[PDB]
Amino acid sequence: GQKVHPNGIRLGIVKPWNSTWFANTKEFADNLDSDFKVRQYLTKELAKASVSRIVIERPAKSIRVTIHTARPGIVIGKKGEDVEKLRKVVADIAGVPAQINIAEVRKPELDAKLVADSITSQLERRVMFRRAMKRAVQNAMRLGAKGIKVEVSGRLGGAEIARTEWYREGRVPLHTLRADIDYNTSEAHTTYGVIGVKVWIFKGEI
Amino acid sequence: VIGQRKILPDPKFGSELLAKFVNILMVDGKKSTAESIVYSALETLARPVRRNALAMRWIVEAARKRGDKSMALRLANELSDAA
Amino acid sequence: QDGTFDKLTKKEALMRTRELEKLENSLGGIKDMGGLPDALFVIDADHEHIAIKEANNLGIPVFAIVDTNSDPDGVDFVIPGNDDAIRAVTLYLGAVAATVREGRS
RNA sequence: UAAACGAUGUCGACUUGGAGGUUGUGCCCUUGAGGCGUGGCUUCCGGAGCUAACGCGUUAAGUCGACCGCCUGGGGAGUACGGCCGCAAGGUUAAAACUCAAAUGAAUUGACGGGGGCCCGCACAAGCGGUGGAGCAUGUGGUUUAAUUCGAUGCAACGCGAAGAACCUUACCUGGUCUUGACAUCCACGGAAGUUUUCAGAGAUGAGAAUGUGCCUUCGGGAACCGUGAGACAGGUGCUGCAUGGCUGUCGUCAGCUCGUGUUGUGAAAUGUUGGGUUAAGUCCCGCAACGAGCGCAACCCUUAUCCUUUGUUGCCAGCGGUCCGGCCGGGAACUCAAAGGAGACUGCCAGUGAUAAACUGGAGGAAGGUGGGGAUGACGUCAAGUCAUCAUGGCCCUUACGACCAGGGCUACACACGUGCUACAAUGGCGCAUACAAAGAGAAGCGACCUCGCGAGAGCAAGCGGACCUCAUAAAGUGCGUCGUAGUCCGGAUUGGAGUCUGCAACUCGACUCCAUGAAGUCGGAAUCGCUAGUAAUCGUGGAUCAGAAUGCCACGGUGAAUACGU
């Protein structure tokens, strides 16, 4: 490889942790494994809910999983029954009386995960990716983000040869550690090969 | 270009013309042993970085396997022969 | 000013500024209405032919002084005098400054 | 007859310039040139114009006029035939059939370009320490075996995946066994599961014996699980890493890579992205048809150095008190220290050099001097580099089966070829005794103290500690004295034996270490090559990961702590 992951290197910088609990070595592995258990059956059950982040935190023997979604209505449901049923699936797969908080993700096409997911959604629907990848390229420009990069990976179009194309616009100073780079990836399970997508969102300095 | 390293003068006598000598007869970062080597040889006997360095290195470099009681005192004999 | 006050340390800001004011001698000369030039006056036509070329490309009248080497082709209001002997060109400069400063009347 | 060429017919006229050479000549210097003309020839720049462009440009390829010669896609072919000419020698005139869809000019980009320079770099120079010799550790190829599992296999594989192989492990094999399967879901039948059992087997399992039969029981059956029945299906460390994703190494923390707008060009395209310097730097100044911008460089992030503020414990003890004299306790909050925040370093200033500038050279202050130091951070792209065996995945393959379980044994087997090491090969020393000064870490099936036994692996008892509170843990090197006197040795520890000591169902395969006991090979190693410019090489210890147990390996910590640089 060549590149560092922009989000994790800024973990001690403007990018905040999306898993904030303090636990000892004894429960650290169990809590971390419990985090993956609650997360794996939280994104899978909300694959069409525009989930941006799933932040986990354990104040006192009860985790409070807040979900960043651009469409809270599908996650909340009618009068919060969907959060309620998801809550008791988290509550018994995490061992704690968990509760699920919800947060609207304003300006959805400006989220790294959502852009990666949105492109991935309309990528296996048998459409040409040149226009599809520009849609995230174009949409971000009118709504700020004075810097962005949307890279796609191998098996671009029905072919036996892998390709790569990224089509930068704006400025993406990934070397600058206070760049506040929103970055996330996704992969598309197409009938041929696997196509991974990678997007960087430069939401201004600090 | 850059100059050679400046070393503080030998504290024991406050003189710069002895520290460079004790640093090369030194082996394996054992300066403490080095005084046990040369001070017993010195306190009891009673460009400037090219020819002085090279010539004086030749003195130190022949005391590895000469086969006697101890080259700690043999080098004292060698410098006594030199002096 | 407030950049040195709040964001940048004084030393680094002062050096970047110190290396950067070198151009506002030309820049600040043009900000009264963001430029929008309507005429140009050039004292040495040949030595600054580039300006004449851009001006006539934009279809702008040109006020030029040509002596022996430059050409009247690029210019429309030619002033066939010297580009040197600073007294004469400064007299032209004072004259044009005045005659644009009673144009409003 | 010639590339007989300026590849440019002859003649005339007209149309801006600049720089020459050669040869006349007029005026005035009546010195020889001279200064100013004025002709002819001629070389080179360039304007308009012209040209496809290259170019030509008053010696036109401009603008015209007169006349002549010539051309009409490439090849066949300046060939055949005839004529004429010639001493044959050949020349000249000059076809066609046939075939091809081009052939061609000029210019653009960028590719070998074995005609260059320039710059930078422990790359060389200097110096330091080494590897290739040996014994072991590990890894790689090769030999056998059922298997010695698979992949990695120049620099960018070879103490690699594997950061840890007695079974399991482990993907391999021998044997036994199961076929909706050990693992997942769905349908049905039963029994609760669970617990106590035996018997045959190695177990997987099978044949039996007791208890239970728990919450609803809305009376079924669920709530769970187990066994069985047919089916879908499961399952695969199976195969393609040139199908891939993802992730990684690679040139290389090298400095370049491009874009917007402009400009130039009919145009492909060029410019930007250039010289001088300058930087570590496409770092930046100066003149430049380009200005800018993006990723690039720096810096922002972490650590370290000085100081300050805050808090003062489990940390410290400057002052006071006496001390079970030990910060031990009052007590002090000074100081170290601890962790939070700031200040401080910015060529800031000065001198000089340098274009005055960039920049550099030194100095001053400053703890830190010229990005003070070290980390993190790797541009477009480079290797169809590697991974399908971490995972995901396209296709392919076996579904009473390379599937699966179990037991066993493999994976560590050698006869070698080489890495990577450690042990070292000792008298800057080794052994014996007193023997001081570290940091950094970890500890609950745990670090485990004291004491006792114990030659020790150690064992028994068992305080404390989930921790600036106790343990790991006496750090060695170092110091003082004595001693060993070149002895293949007091070094060195392989190898081999008795017994252990711990871990586990179980260690011989194939654990570690020790008590005791061996005690060889190794006295510096071949061309060659590797790493290194400061707390750096070079030593010595410390802890941690993985880990029931299993570090010469890895990661991190400290102590002691060097020498060299003339330059490309």
From Swiss-Prot, chain B:
- Please list which residues make up the signal peptide: none
What does it do? One of the primary rRNA binding proteins, it binds directly to 16S rRNA where it nucleates assembly of the head domain of the 30S subunit. Is located at the subunit interface close to the decoding center, where it has been shown to contact mRNA. Has been shown to contact tRNA in both the P and E sites; it probably blocks exit of the E site tRNA.
Additional observations: The strain K12 sequence is shown.
Quaternary structure annotation from Swiss-Prot or TrEMBL: Part of the 30S ribosomal subunit. Contacts proteins S9 and S11. Cross-links to IF3 and the P and E site tRNAs.
Q: Which protein family is named in the record?
A: Belongs to the universal ribosomal protein uS7 family.
Q: What is this protein called?
A: Small ribosomal subunit protein uS7
